[PDB]
């Protein structure tokens, strides 16, 4: 009966919007849906055996003119190997490095802030690693609906082949990839518009076999609360 609980139904496939940046320049954007998640790879000839939809980062020669940057980006892509795998399991987003390119992740804004912040951690190689929990996200989302100020962050940013930009802008980095589960973007936006001049608003979760929902502010909050109770916490 709770239409938001479709998000956690076994077999459901979230849409992941993947945006790649070469030195602060957008060079790639694609939305994928896959049960085994995705894998950010460096070439078309990778390794089919590894599960997950292969997301091939483009050759810098198609977008860049800096020969020095092109060479360094090409070396990063060629060392990606198996690549960076991102998949979903329940209320968690998991990440694992399958190549030799150290990758550092962080949950941040839709656009990486001019100021900076730092990494939330390094993507592990020899084992799995959680990079996002839907649990605390909805809890913050509910708190946000209650007008407590700050919307929850949902944009996963990955720094590939280099350490995280702490003492330098993110635009200096060779390969920066943003991955946004479009359902989270939709949820936040629905919360944002929820407290405005309209009885009902439309939210589209952009997940498999989902229809656009038209809810009032209070029943959207109610659905959020019920979704929370059904989720796991320590």
């Amino acid at each position: 009966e709770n239409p938001l609980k479709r998000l956690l139904v076994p077999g459901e496939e979230w849409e992941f919007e993947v945006t790649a940046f070469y030195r602060g320049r957008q060079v790639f954007q694609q939305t994928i849906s896959c049960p085994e998640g995705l894998r950010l790879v460096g070439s078309e000839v990778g390794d089919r055996t590894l599960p997950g939809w292969p997301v091939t980062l483009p050759d810098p020669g198609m977008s860049l003119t800096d020969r020095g940057v092109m060479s360094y980006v090409r070396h990063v892509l060629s060392c990606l190997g198996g690549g960076l795998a991102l998949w979903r399991a329940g209320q968690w987003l998991w990440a694992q490095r399958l190549g030799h390119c150290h990758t550092y992740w962080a949950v941040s804004e839709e656009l990486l802030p001019n100021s900076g912040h730092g990494p939330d951690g390094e993507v592990p190689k020899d084992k799995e690693g959680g990079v996002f929990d839907l649990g605390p996200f909805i809890v913050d989302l509910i708190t946000f609906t209650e007008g407590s100020g700050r919307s929850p962050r949902y944009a996963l940013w990955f720094c590939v082949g280099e350490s995280w930009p702490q003492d330098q802008p993110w635009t200096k980095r060779l390969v920066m990839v943003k991955v946004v589960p479009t359902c989270l973007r939709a949820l936040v936006e629905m919360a944002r518009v929820g407290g405005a001049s309209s009885l009902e608003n439309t939210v589209d979760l952009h997940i498999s076999n989902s229809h656009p929902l038209s809810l009032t502010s209070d029943q959207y909050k109610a659905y959020l609360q019920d979704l929370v109770e059904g989720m796991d916490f320590q």
Binding site: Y72, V76, C79, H100, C101, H102, Y104, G161, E162, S163
Partner: peptide, 14 residues
């Protein structure tokens, strides 16, 4: 160029 300075890439092995 040359070497690739200040990259976070572990040595190759297969």
């Amino acid at each position: 160029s040359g070497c690739f300075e200040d990259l976070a890439i572990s040595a190759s092995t297969s």
